[PDB]
């Protein structure tokens, strides 16, 4: 039961530095998934002693460090540019009881490189009505608007309501702020009794919004 946990989303100015951490709750890897570029290998490190081997592209700008006594790995990227906007992952491999290899990855950290200002989300209810019912099932949700940067993460109620939830890919508004929607489909009869709340977490602005979604006629 090994699990990798990463620090939160960051926005930095071009030419600035960012540090992503990776805690463990075989050599380990830093990988990124960037706009256009796809998956990109950054480098590897020995978790036991901190020896490093970088991808050439990254040797100048990236530095990988390990704190073996906390089991925390770090990756710092300097001289940030727009191409560095990406989800950064730490990952490792091991083998199971009978010798099969497997891997495990952190949840990823989105780093946005931008000079634009940070904007916390506007959260509005998509109210369930006769116009959002399809028989037996009603749809409801929340519209998240006017935020920057990504990501906003949406969970419902206590955060253990996940079945029937669709959280749509982020879009660009006319203003170039970001918008998304999360929509949950529920048994019609439950609207009576259950209270539905969208929890919208925007780590870049240190903002969470809890919005109740009431039915409308």
């Amino acid at each position: 039961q090994v699990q990798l946990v990463q620090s939160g989303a960051e926005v930095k100015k071009p030419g600035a530095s960012v540090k992503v951490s990776c805690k463990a709750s075989h050599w380990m890897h830093w990988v990124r998934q960037a706009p256009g570029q796809g998956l990109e290998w950054i480098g590897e490190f020995n978790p036991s002693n901190g020896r490093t081997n970088y991808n050439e592209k990254f040797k100048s700008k990236a530095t990988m460090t390990v704190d073996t006594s906390t089991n925390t790995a770090y990756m710092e990227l300097s001289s940030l540019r727009s191409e560095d906007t990406a989800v950064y992952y730490c990952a490792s491999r091991d083998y199971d009881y009978d010798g099969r290899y497997f891997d495990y990855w952190g949840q990823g950290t989105l780093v946005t490189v931008s000079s634009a200002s940070t904007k916390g989300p506007s959260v509005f209810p998509l109210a369930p009505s006769s116009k959002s019912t399809s028989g037996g099932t009603a749809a409801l949700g929340c519209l998240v608007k006017d935020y920057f940067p990504e990501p906003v993460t949406v969970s419902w109620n206590s955060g253990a309501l996940t079945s029937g939830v669709h959280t749509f890919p982020a879009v660009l508004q006319s203003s170039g702020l970001y918008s998304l929607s999360s929509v949950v489909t529920v048994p019609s009869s439950s609207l009576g009794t259950q209270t539905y709340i969208c929890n919208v977490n925007h780590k870049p602005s240190n903002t969470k919004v809890d919005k109740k979604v009431e039915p409308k006629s």
């Binding site: 290998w41 081997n53 991808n55 992952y89 290899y101 497997f102 982020a170 006319s174 918008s179 929607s181």
Partner: protein, 206 residues
């Protein structure tokens, strides 16, 4: 390096094959389901990772490598990546999106009026939702007092859901309060293969 195809559609139970061309020592294959982190399925070319079903396989030599799913299941909906290794040196393919082919399913079309809270803040968003359709292709048109709109509108679609092999789509139309109040009828009109005619979902007021 190139990975092909870049997208493929197949029925449940179909055998499915992805290739990844070219001085490589080993090929690795990763699965990335919607939105999770990638997951290693095949390593050193041909070896299944811990807990990977027997329906997955990998093979290759020199420059040409293959990844096979011998009986495609809905849980296999994902983007798959090859990754070559030499030389202290790791590079990834471009990705192959894998979709299930199913029967045509018409969208349920829903509409959401602007919230009171938004209206009080000087803006008005209408949301149109198309739920659980296949295939992905649809036409969505916004109409205000019968006038086709462009662009105060956005749209996005889920990746294919593994539980019924369908997509969903959300579309937002956004006006000022002032503009919203000057007009009466708000409608999204939807065309899709599984619909018998265009469905208009609408509401009045403002």
């Amino acid at each position: 390096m190139t990975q092909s195809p870049s997208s493929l559609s197949a029925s449940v139970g179909d055998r499915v094959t992805i290739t990844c061309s070219a001085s490589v020592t080993y090929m690795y294959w990763y699965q990335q389901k919607p939105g999770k982190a990638p997951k290693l399925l095949i390593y050193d070319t041909s070896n299944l990772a811990s807990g990977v079903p027997s329906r997955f396989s990998g093979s290759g030599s020199g420059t040409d490598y293959t990844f096979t799913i011998s009986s495609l299941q809905p849980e296999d909906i994902a983007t798959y990546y090859c990754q070559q290794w030499s030389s202290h040196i790791f590079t990834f393919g471009q990705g192959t999106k894998v979709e299930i082919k199913r029967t045509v399913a018409a969208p349920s079309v829903f509409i959401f009026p602007p919230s009171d809270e938004q209206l009080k803040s000087g803006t008005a968003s209408v949301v149109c939702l198309l739920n659980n359709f296949y295939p992905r292709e649809a036409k969505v048109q916004w109409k205000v007092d019968n006038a086709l709109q462009s662009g105060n509108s956005q749209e996005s679609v889920t990746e294919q859901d593994s539980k019924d092999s369908t997509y969903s789509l959300s579309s937002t139309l956004t006006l000022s309060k002032a503009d919203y109040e000057k007009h009466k009828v708000y409608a999204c009109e939807v065309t899709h293969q599984g619909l018998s005619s265009p469905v208009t979902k609408s509401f009045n007021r403002g």
